[PDB]
Design a protein around this nucleic acid. Structure first.
Lengths: 393, 101, 14, 118, 49, 113, 116, 105, 118, 316, 49, 154, 41, 24, 147
RNA sequence: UUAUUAUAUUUAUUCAUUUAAGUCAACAAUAUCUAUUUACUGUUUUUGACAACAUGAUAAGGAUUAUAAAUGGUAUUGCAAAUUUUAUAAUCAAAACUAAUUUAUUAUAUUAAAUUAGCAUGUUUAGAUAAAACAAUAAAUUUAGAAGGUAUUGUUGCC
């Protein structure tokens, strides 16, 4: 009428005082109605959602309404494990759900490997509900939901949204923080190399190498260390001197000889199939017993950082220590942990796969025979007097 | 402007007494237009962005070719033992572009 | 409607 | 067979005049006969590649050879195990069909000529 | 001007027309996760099933 | 089959008392949403060119200003031709009378002879 | 299967266009409308589609597609095509899976080979 | 103009002639005066050329027949193989005879 | 082939004048009938009857399939791995595989019910 | 044949006339219309970006180990997209006491950075401004010290001094031009949005002289700067010299933004002034020039009965 | 899947007529030949006899 | 693979085929195809080379349209604004609504009987290069020796 | 604009018919009711 | 898969049996 | 700056060669006779093979001079409707001179028809030629076939 | 009443319906680089399509051009394109006949759901009168070809 028509719900009256209705026969109705019959498929639908329920001018998401008791119920209901009860109630939710909702929702998808559901939850809160679902805690569930499903494909697809694209990370500013990104990445790295995923595992690790997040486990451990010292007034420094002495940085050192003598045999015993002269000097790799293994601290780390330069061996042993289960294999199962780490220093490295190649046959260069195309004259190095000339000549 | 021209005939009693169209007939094959393109700044932004990213990899390598001053320490001050960090300065400096060094 | 704004101080840029 | 397929798209054109839709239904044929022949041909170029003596591509995934052996109770005695070989045989046991259905299509694509288009 | 009307739309104009309009992202029809029986049909009131 | 209009399906339920106020009927009633009546709602409008767009927007882009429908033109021209030749039929009927019942401080209209 | 499949279709004129022509008019009057064309340019980086007609190798309008040509991917069922036993098929026979036709077809039955 | 298309591009034929032979001199003009008086015994009962019917498209607003081929006419020969009895795709049976022998086979 | 389909859905552009088309795609789709969500279990002891199928029964009488099932179970005061597998009617080995993080049972923590549970 | 026009898309007599196809002709495609792919237009929507962050970003730069340790002492500050409501005194106390413990000049900056975002969102920039006095300006700004501030610091503090009106933007900002650390370009468009309005809130017409000069100098989105902001930086200008500068300035703003300026300015002033937390100084001369400037850049619709109402037919 | 390429292709009716022609095609005819189900199962039981 | 497509999608045809618009633009349409196939294959789309993403992002914006835009993209304003944009940009000959063609080529007289009356059976707006007066027949290069624009006789 | 020779033009304005002939049987029988009804042939 | 498949623009893919147009 | 004109190999291969490698390789492919890989940057879809024949037939008004005499009979089949082409099956015969003398051509077709019934007997009795044959089996099959 | 071709020909008849006004303009909200545009406000001079006069324009209607695929017309029938100079008259739920231009169901079985028809039993009986020659079945009591007008779109003519 004069102010941009804002429909009111409580103040609706027979007389309709605010004049917010498409009246039939008032002057200047033709142009008004013709806009109605030209409304889009979703006009009363999208407008009502866009007019209200927009992100806060200061930046945050406008969570609080009187609807909060509903959201508490879900996080009261989802944590119990009554997932379908949450979802069949979650449909009643109208406003933007706060992030603690989905943390509880996707938590219920973990027990039954209901991977199809967590993603459907994600893609709803992701880019359809103002990117509130973009939370390192949320994806931490979906990843653990895909692992139990053993669906390596979507694991990377979670990593696809984890690091995000320029949209989600710049204009929306909803980027998974440094700490949560490390966890999700480590969870990703942790599963594949146990499932022996060869190529897909090498991919994501480079991100941690590129983002130099390779040693956050020390940082997250040293971060917990600094928590108390800040409270007590101690001066905290993050320098390599501590990183050379942390408990995690220490046990990895001592456990190295089992690691070294394992990969050597696991290299040897395999090539025994391809190249007969395993257990012979006819092998690229060098004996760890004829160097600083067994008393690793001498040169085993110098042996690892030699045979496996492409990946950082000190880092993967910090990963091979525990499972997802937090069971410290290192202390509670020595032979499993090392033969585990034998996988990780193997698969993550690409150069090590090169030295692990078997001898192939030598193709005989050929010029075509006179008779047929597929029939070709072979290049015997024998059957020519001139001995020095080659097929290329 | 020159693109613009009289698209409507002068108001006249011809418009009423004639089946000539008021508007053109639609062309089936004229695909529906839609905003799909890059502005000046948006180009200049995505231009400016890639410049930043290449710098970092340059800055990484060029700051890492300071392995020459790592190398310079060996040959002149104290050569080394044949331990790693001799081969590591050998592996790096070879792959770092100091073929001779 | 011209001039809108006073152009500039008189100068000798050479 | 002449009606064996994995996906069957049916396109229903709709014009006000019979001779319109016919001449059109003639056009798209000599269109899909082109793109259909080429697109299917690339996969046929891939299939014969996925088989031959030093042409591997069906070299079984360690993942796939698990799914065949991811079953508590198989075909012949107890709990079962397939070797990677017969797995690489089962695969070739199927590509042989995706070829026979492929090449049987290219043939029925090249039959209609302007002289005898039916 | 001389009656040569194309019995078939030439291959050129095929590519030129077919590149003026964008692919619907939904007709791609990819799904390896499956169907979400608990949640999918119960999504938010905006885009709900 | 022997009947002329064999459709194979049971078209009508032969229950004569079947009505729309019935409960079971309304369970199976087809909502008018997105049916013939929707199409007739938006396509069967007085000026069929208005469903495409607002006319002003068109005469803003294609033309330079909004032009009235062909009727107002014929209304307009014919007023001029009569008013140029004749007078004494001009009934100064306007939507709002304020502009006429009270002319502003200026605007002394030239005495029309 | 045209004899000289390489040349007849590998020609810029499909074997049927008279590239061996000056652009001159003939003795007839209907051709006297056009005359003998001025010499073709000596230094001419001409357009890929066109040419200067100086010879067969330079037609007035080029026809051969610059992009190289694959042969038509033939419609033969290699899967059941009779094939000769290569030396490896003599050598690597125990590592073959084949249908009983393959093992017993008259076109090189691989079973008497395997037995041998 | 939106109308600059609707003008005519050439010079239309001009009116310098009399009424054609025996045409307007009640008499409905649509019927050809002499051509229809031509005895059917000599010209037959045909109105449109005797070609396979599928060529003709039922015209709109102009009560006649028009060929979907632009004035070209394919004889009955093209509608069948070489020397086909009664112009059938196959010599053996008619429409119905090929309808029901299908099932019986 | 999706590259072919997007040649198809582009036919709508260059069709002959006044002729719309519609596509009837018919593609095989792999579907998982996971018994974990839909269990082929015995009848309910109290068989539902016509009293559960009046009008609006879909509205008030049936939680839309699939039925919700608890996947989370708390280990009770002194249950063992065979004792939990007991009450969940599942295999202790399947239970050991199901809950990777649960090496020792601490009373009061919830075990993740295996999918194959009965 | 009447007032009701013929629908050219559905009439045979038209569609099957000679001025279009006939239904008999081969009916092929006339001409391929390559419009969107030869001269494509970019996506400038009217409905603002729904998911745009709509604010400055402070962008922590602390070492990963610190983030884990600093987690609770940072969590009272605004996290990524989420801001609690602790009192600023509860924060600045927490920083000053814990500052010496953090052995990092960098980490403390990011620590101090979020505090700016905290105080700015709490509008309590006045107290954190003293933290700029005690901590930042000495080691960084004083006498061209070698230690140049990491980007988030000025990124943050320029919001701090802007959100709560404090004239301490001029010292830092002037050190951000070509002469100083040259952090001027990396700013987002929101940075200049709050910046200009703060000036307009303050009334620094001479600051409008500086920052606006950099805008074009930097090639920022001089159109995408939110209209509520530019209204302020214009309305504060009353002196003659800057008045000349603004007239030359508007020809940088695209006509579309210009058409909405005289719409928002005529709104923040007269009709819907209730939006403005700050009552605008009411400068009529700047007001009129804009409304005139907008009706110039826009196309001039020809209204005949206006211009030539009293026009005299000169019969001589 | 039916999109329009006629007078209903471009202007303001582009949406609601498109929405109609899809809600009018909301069906998805799920089919499966029963004889296919007569396979073994991962529990080892014959699936459907 | 993509580095090939976006390269191939740019490869321009010869003269004989470039007479309407670049023909190989359709190959960027194969990017939403491959981008999607990249996910199901388990290959991250955020690991494409930074420079490559300058164009892959362009393909999506060019050739990928979500339904909820497909339902609201042919709006009145969304089209005229695109015409409005061109009017500001100055090239509107390709746009249909603002195309004003006037030159109607005459009928070429068959000298069989130049008295043969001629008419127009159809009319269709083709550009010039189909039948422009034989470039040798018409005079020397005229865009340089003249300016040529059609106006109506006042 | 394509063309093929004319046979008879028939200007059937509301005033009258003026039917010219240059006889043949027929082909497509064009039609225009822009303002004046004409039956091309 | 280019827009113009290899079947058309190629000498070796020429359909010798495909009769020309002005013959039939 | 327009990529299309940039790729255009019209004025030459110059603006497309930057790295000294490709320029070095530019000199190899040209020498051994292959195509320079840079030239393909602007693709030339040569006029299709039929559109060459099609352009020909229109020019000659069906080109009666080169159509076989079977085409001018009733119900011509696609075999006759295409132009005159010296197909490969005339290859072996040499008694035919470029001027067929009295009955020379008549004799050939029998030799052709004889070879075709050989291509039949070679098939039904399992003596087809295989892609993998060598000269040792070639004689072992042909002589077995000629039996 | 001039030397390939037929009218004599049943089957019908009681029939009605309409309400309680309202046009003086346009405005992306998710996943494309940020505009509060959030809630884009500028005060008011005319009389055709109407309740009224206001040019055109397509129908109903049989009477003398098929033997190897056709029995419905132009002169005009309410709402249509140049004549304006009193005036809102439009379907919405629940509602009242005076109207020429209409199959209504006639005695074994008879109201099931948006509200739907109680007086007229009287020899399928006055005068008027209705419609067929078409996949059906009636083929003869019988036909071009000579004729006048005071009218002058002509017998409802004029005198």
């Amino acid at each position: 009428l004069q102010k941009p028509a804002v429909v009111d719900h409580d103040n609706i009256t027979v007389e309709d005082p605010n004049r917010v209705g498409l009246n039939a026969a008032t002057l200047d109705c033709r142009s008004r109605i013709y806009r109605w019959l030209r409304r889009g498929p979703f006009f009363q639908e999208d407008n009502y959602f866009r007019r209200s329920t927009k992100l806060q001018r200061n930046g945050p998401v406008p969570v609080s309404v009187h609807e909060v008791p509903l959201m508490q119920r879900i996080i009261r209901l989802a944590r119990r494990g009554h997932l379908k009860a949450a979802c069949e109630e979650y449909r009643r939710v109208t406003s933007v759900p706060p992030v603690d909702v989905y943390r509880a929702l996707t938590a219920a998808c973990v027990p039954g490997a209901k991977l199809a559901d967590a993603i459907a939850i994600f893609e709803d809160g992701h880019s359809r509900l103002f990117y509130v679902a973009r939370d390192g805690e949320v994806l931490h569930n979906m990843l653990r939901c895909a692992i139990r499903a053993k669906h390596r494909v979507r694991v990377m697809w979670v990593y696809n949204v984890m690091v995000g694209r320029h949209y989600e990370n710049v204009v929306v500013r909803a980027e998974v923080d440094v700490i949560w990104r490390y966890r999700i990445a480590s969870l990703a790295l942790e599963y594949l190399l146990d499932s022996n995923a060869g190529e897909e595992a090498r991919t994501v690790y480079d991100y941690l190498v590129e983002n130099e997040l390779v040693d956050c486990d020390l940082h997250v451990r040293l971060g917990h260390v600094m928590q108390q010292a800040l409270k007590e007034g101690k001066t905290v420094h993050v320098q390599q001197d501590a990183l050379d002495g942390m408990a995690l940085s220490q046990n990895v050192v001592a456990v190295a000889p089992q690691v070294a003598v394992a990969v050597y045999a696991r290299y040897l015993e395999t090539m025994q199939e391809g190249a007969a002269w395993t257990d012979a000097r006819g092998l690229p790799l060098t004996d760890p017993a004829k160097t600083g293994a067994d008393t690793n601290g001498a040169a085993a780390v110098a042996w690892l950082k030699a045979a496996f330069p492409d990946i950082d061996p000190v880092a993967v042993l910090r990963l091979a220590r525990f499972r997802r289960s937090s069971k410290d294999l290192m202390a509670k199962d020595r032979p499993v942990y090392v033969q585990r780490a034998a996988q990780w220093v193997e698969l993550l490295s690409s150069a090590h796969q090169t030295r692990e190649e078997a001898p192939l046959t030598y193709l005989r260069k050929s010029r075509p025979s006179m008779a047929n195309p597929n029939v070709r004259v072979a290049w015997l190095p024998e059957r020519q007097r001139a001995h020095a000339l080659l097929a290329s000549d | 402007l020159s693109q613009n021209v009289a698209r409507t005939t002068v108001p006249s009693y011809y418009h009423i007494r004639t089946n000539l169209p008021q508007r053109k007939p639609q062309n089936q094959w004229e695909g529906v237009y839609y905003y799909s393109g890059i502005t000046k700044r948006q180009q200049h932004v995505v231009l400016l962005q890639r410049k930043r990213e290449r710098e970092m990899y340059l800055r990484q390598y060029n700051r890492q070719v300071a392995s020459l001053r790592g190398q310079y320490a060996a040959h002149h001050e104290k050569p080394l033992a044949s331990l790693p960090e001799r081969l590591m300065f050998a592996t790096k400096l070879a792959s770092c572009g100091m073929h001779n060094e | 409607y011209t001039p809108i704004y006073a152009p500039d101080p008189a100068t000798d840029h050479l | 067979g002449v009606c064996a397929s994995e996906v069957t798209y049916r396109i229903v054109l709709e014009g006000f005049w019979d001779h319109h839709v016919m001449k059109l239904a003639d056009d798209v044929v000599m269109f899909l006969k082109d793109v259909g022949r080429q697109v299917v041909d690339e996969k046929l170029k891939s299939v014969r590649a996925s088989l031959e003596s030093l042409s591997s591509g069906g070299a079984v995934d360690p993942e796939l050879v698990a799914a065949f052996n991811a079953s508590l109770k198989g075909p012949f005695g107890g709990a079962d195990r397939y070797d990677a070989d017969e797995v690489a045989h089962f695969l070739r046991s199927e590509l042989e069909r995706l070829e026979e259905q492929c090449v049987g299509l290219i043939n029925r694509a090249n039959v209609p000529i302007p002289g005898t288009s039916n | 001007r001389q009656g040569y009307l194309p019995r078939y739309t030439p291959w050129e104009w095929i590519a030129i027309q077919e590149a003026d309009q964008p692919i619907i992202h939904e007709t791609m029809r990819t799904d390896n996760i499956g169907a979400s029986y608990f949640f999918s049909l119960n999504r938010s009131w905006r885009y709900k099933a | 089959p022997e009947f002329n209009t064999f459709t194979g399906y049971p078209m009508r339920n032969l229950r004569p008392g079947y009505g729309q106020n019935l409960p079971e009927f309304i369970m199976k009633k087809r909502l008018p949403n997105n049916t013939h009546y929707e199409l007739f709602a938006r396509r069967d409008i007085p000026n069929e060119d208005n469903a495409m767009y607002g006319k002003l927007l068109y005469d803003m882009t294609i033309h330079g200003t909004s032009l009235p429908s062909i009727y107002r033109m014929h209304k307009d021209i014919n007023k001029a031709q009569r008013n140029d030749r004749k007078l004494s039929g001009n009934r100064f009927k306007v939507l709002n009378s304020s502009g006429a019942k009270s002319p502003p401080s200026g605007f002394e209209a030239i005495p029309d002879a | 299967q045209l004899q000289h499949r390489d040349r007849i279709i590998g020609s810029h004129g499909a074997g049927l266009v008279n590239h061996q022509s000056m652009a001159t008019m003939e003795i007839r009057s209907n051709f006297t409308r056009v005359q003998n064309a001025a010499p073709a340019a000596d230094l001419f980086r001409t357009k890929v589609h066109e040419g200067l007609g100086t010879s067969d190798k330079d037609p007035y309008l080029r026809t051969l597609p610059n992009q190289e040509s694959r042969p038509p991917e033939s419609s033969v069922l290699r899967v059941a095509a009779a094939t000769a036993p290569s030396l490896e098929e003599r050598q690597c026979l125990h590592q073959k899976w084949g249908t009983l036709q393959y093992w017993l077809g008259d076109q090189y039955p691989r079973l008497p080979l395997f037995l041998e | 103009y939106y109308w600059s298309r609707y003008r005519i591009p050439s010079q239309m034929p001009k009116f310098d002639g009399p009424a054609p032979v025996a045409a307007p001199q009640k008499t409905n003009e649509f019927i050809d005066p002499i051509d229809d008086k031509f005895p059917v015994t000599i010209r037959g009962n045909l109105v449109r050329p005797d070609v396979p019917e599928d060529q003709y498209v039922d015209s709109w607003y102009v009560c006649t027949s028009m060929t979907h081929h632009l004035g070209d006419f394919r004889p009955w020969s093209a509608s069948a193989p070489a020397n086909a009895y009664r112009f059938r795709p196959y010599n053996e049976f008619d429409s119905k005879g090929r309808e029901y022998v299908e099932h019986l086979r | 082939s999706t590259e072919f389909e997007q040649r198809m859905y582009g036919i709508r552009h260059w069709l002959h004048r006044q002729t719309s088309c519609e596509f009837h795609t018919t593609y095989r789709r792999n579907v998982v009938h996971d018994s974990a969500v839909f269990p082929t279990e015995h009848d309910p002891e109290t068989k539902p009857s016509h009293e559960h199928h009046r009008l609006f029964s879909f509205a008030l009488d049936w939680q839309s399939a699939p039925v919700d099932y608890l996947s989370v179970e708390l280990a009770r005061e002194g249950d063992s791995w065979s004792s939990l597998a007991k009450r969940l009617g599942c295999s202790e080995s399947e239970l050991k595989a199901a809950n990777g993080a649960m090496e020792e049972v601490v009373a009061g923590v919830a075990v993740s019910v295996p999918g194959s549970a009965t | 044949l009447g007032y009701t026009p013929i629908n050219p898309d559905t009439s045979p007599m038209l569609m099957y006339s000679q001025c279009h196809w006939h239904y008999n002709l081969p009916q092929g495609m006339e001409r391929p219309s390559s419009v969107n792919r030869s001269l494509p237009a970019p996506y400038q929507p009217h409905h603002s970006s729904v998911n745009k962050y709509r604010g400055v970003w402070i962008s922590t730069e602390m070492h990963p180990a610190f983030l884990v340790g600093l987690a609770p002492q940072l969590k009272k500050l605004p996290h990524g997209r989420v801001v609690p409501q602790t009192p600023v005194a509860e924060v600045i106390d927490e920083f000053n006491k814990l500052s010496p413990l953090i052995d990092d000049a960098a980490a403390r900056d990011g620590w101090l950075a979020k505090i700016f975002q905290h105080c700015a969102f709490q509008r309590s920039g006045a107290e954190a401004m003293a933290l700029w006095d005690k901590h930042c300006a000495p080691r960084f700004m004083r006498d061209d010290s070698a230690s140049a501030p990491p980007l988030p610091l000025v990124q943050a503090i320029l919001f701090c001094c802007s959100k709560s009106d404090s004239a301490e933007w001029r010292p830092i900002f002037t050190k951000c031009l070509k002469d100083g650390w040259n952090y001027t370009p990396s700013f987002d468009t929101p940075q200049w949005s709050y910046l200009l309005k703060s000036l307009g809130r303050q009334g620094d017409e001479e600051g409008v002289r500086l920052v606006l000069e950099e805008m074009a100098d930097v090639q920022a989105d001089l159109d995408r700067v939110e209209a509520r902001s530019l209204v302020y930086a214009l309305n504060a200008v009353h002196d003659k010299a800057i008045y000349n500068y603004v007239k030359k300035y508007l020809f940088y703003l695209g006509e579309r933004k210009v058409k909405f300026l005289r719409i928002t300015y005529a709104d923040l002033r007269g009709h819907g002034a209730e939006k403005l937390r700050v009552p605008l100084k009411e400068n009529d001369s700047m007001f009129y020039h804009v409304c005139w400037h907008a009706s110039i850049r826009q196309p001039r619709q020809f209204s005949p009965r206006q211009l030539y109402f009293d026009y005299a037919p000169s019969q001589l | 899947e039916q999109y329009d390429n006629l007078q209903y292709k471009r202007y303001d009716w582009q949406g609601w007529y498109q929405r109609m022609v899809d809600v009018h095609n909301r069906n998805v005819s799920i089919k499966c030949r029963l004889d296919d189900l007569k396979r073994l199962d991962a529990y080892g039981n014959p699936f459907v006899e | 693979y993509l580095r090939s497509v976006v390269d191939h999608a740019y490869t321009p045809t010869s003269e004989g085929l470039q007479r309407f618009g670049s023909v190989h633009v359709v190959e960027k349409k194969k990017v939403p195809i491959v981008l999607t196939q990249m996910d199901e294959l388990g290959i991250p789309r955020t690991h494409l080379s930074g420079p490559l993403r300058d164009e892959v992002e362009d393909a999506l914006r060019k050739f990928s349209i979500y339904r909820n835009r497909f339902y609201e993209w042919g709006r009145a304003v969304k089209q005229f604004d695109f015409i409005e944009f061109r009017r500001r940009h100055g090239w509107m000959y390709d746009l249909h609504l603002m195309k004003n063609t006037t030159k109607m080529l005459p009928p070429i007289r068959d000298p069989s009987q130049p008295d043969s009356t001629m008419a127009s059976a159809a009319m269709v707006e083709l550009p010039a290069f189909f039948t422009e007066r034989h470039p040798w027949e018409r005079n020397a290069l005229e865009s340089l020796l003249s300016v040529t624009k059609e106006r109506e006789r006042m | 604009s394509i063309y093929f020779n004319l046979n008879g033009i028939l200007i059937w304005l509301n005033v009258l018919h003026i039917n010219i002939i240059l006889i043949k049987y027929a082909f497509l029988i064009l039609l225009n009711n822009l303002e004046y009804l004409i039956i091309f042939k | 898969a280019p827009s113009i498949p290899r079947s058309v623009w190629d000498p070796a893919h020429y359909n010798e049996n495909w009769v020309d147009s002005y013959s039939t | 700056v327009d990529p299309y004109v940039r790729r255009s190999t019209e004025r030459g291969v110059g603006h497309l060669l930057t790295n000294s490698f490709d320029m070095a390789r530019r000199e190899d492919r040209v020498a051994h006779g292959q195509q320079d890989l840079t030239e393909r940057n602007t693709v030339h879809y040569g006029v299709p093979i039929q559109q060459s024949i099609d352009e020909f037939v229109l020019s000659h008004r069906n080109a009666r001079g080169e159509r076989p005499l079977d085409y001018f009979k009733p119900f011509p089949d696609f075999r006759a409707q295409r132009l005159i082409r010296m197909y490969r099956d005339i290859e072996g015969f040499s008694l035919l001179k470029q001027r067929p003398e009295a009955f020379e051509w008549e004799l050939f077709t029998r030799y052709r028809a004889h070879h075709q019934q050989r291509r039949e007997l070679a098939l039904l009795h399992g003596l087809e030629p295989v892609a993998n044959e060598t000269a040792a089996e070639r004689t072992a099959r042909r002589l077995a076939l000629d039996e």
